[PDB]
């Protein structure tokens, strides 16, 4: 029933909401040389947030 927000849209767009975030995590993670604190702060998130994002894509 209905459309728009009544029927969940897939990640159809290249610039997904979280996709943009992960991209920002990388550009900072590179420049701060793996400083998770700078990354999370530059991503506007908690250190755990940045960590979990890294930790789900690595055995770390």
- Cα–Cα dist 60/51, whole Å: 9
Domain boundaries defined on the chain: 1-60
Contact status, residue 9 vs residue 16, Cβ threshold 8 Å: no
Output the CA–CA distances (angstroms, integers) from residue 9 to 2, 3, 5, 31, 38, in the order listed.
13, 9, 8, 34, 32
Classify domain 1-60 at the CATH class level.
mainly alpha
Report which of 37, 48, 24 is spatially closest to residue 56, judged by C-alpha positions.
Answer: 48
Q: Say what angle helices 47-55 and 17-31 make with each other, to 10 degrees.
A: 100
39: left (phi over 0), alpha (psi -120 to 50) or beta: alpha
At a CB cut-off of 8 Å and minimum separation 6, what does 20 contact?
A: none
């Amino acid at each position: 029933l209905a459309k728009g927000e009544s029927l969940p849209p897939p990640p159809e767009n290249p610039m997904s909401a979280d996709r943009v975030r992960w991209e920002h995590i990388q550009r900072i993670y590179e420049m701060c040389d793996r400083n998770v604190s700078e990354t999370a702060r530059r991503l506007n998130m908690h250190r755990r947030t940045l960590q979990r994002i890294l930790a789900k894509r690595s055995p770390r």
